[PDB]
Amino acid sequence: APWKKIQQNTFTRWCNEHLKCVNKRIGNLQTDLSDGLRLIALLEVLSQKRMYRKYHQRPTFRQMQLENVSVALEFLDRESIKLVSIDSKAIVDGNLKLILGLVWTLILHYSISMPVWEDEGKKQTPKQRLLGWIQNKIPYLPITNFNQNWQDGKALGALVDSCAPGLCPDWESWDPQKPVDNAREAVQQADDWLGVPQVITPEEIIHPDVDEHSVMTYLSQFPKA
């Protein structure tokens, strides 16, 4: 069921967008955080803070890897970031379910909850906040979810044009039976002119099995900048 890794793919691309700035990259989320170094780097970029505890720069041994991940998880507890049950061995041993959970916590926190957004005038969940911001941008479409509302590709057109009128001016006239073409046009225009990276692909975002977290990860880039 290759559709089931859309979230893994999307989370990996998001991580890489951040790791870019420190000349690092993840090829495989299941393995490439397990020594702790890329995780620590990612947290430093996200928080614009350095690790306060020392850690092992050449963690060739299992205990050093466990310790590296522990420093990272402590850092998160110290920043009042609520973590779902996770220990260092889950990361070190490549527990993909829990790794994806950890990365989601970071996306929700740093990309949705914490940032300062324009177009805001309010005691609500991060998902409500994101929905609210998007709904304000495209007030003529009912935006209540991060799956089915995005399936025909047209809401993407509407959002991109709302951000810069002229990018997708004819979105309302787009054929809803050409979802991949619609999505690809909107997403490329956003990439080319709005500085919004394709952390989800056009094919993934309109997939009937797309998960809300993957879509939220992409769309959270719009209010950021």
Q: Where in the chain is the domain with CATH 1.10.418.10?
A: 1-115, 116-225
116-225 fold: Actin-binding Protein, T-fimbrin; domain 1 (1.10.418)
- State the structure-solving technique: X-ray
Please tell me what resolution, in angstroms, this structure has.
1.9
Give the per-residue SS3 of 17-61: HHHHHHCCCCCCCCCCCCCCHHHHHHHHHHHCCCCCCCCCCCCCC
Q: Which amino acid is at 50?
A: R
Give the torsion through C-alpha atoms of 96, 101, 102, 106, to 10 deg.
140
CATH classification of 1-115 is 3.30.210.10, yes or no?
no
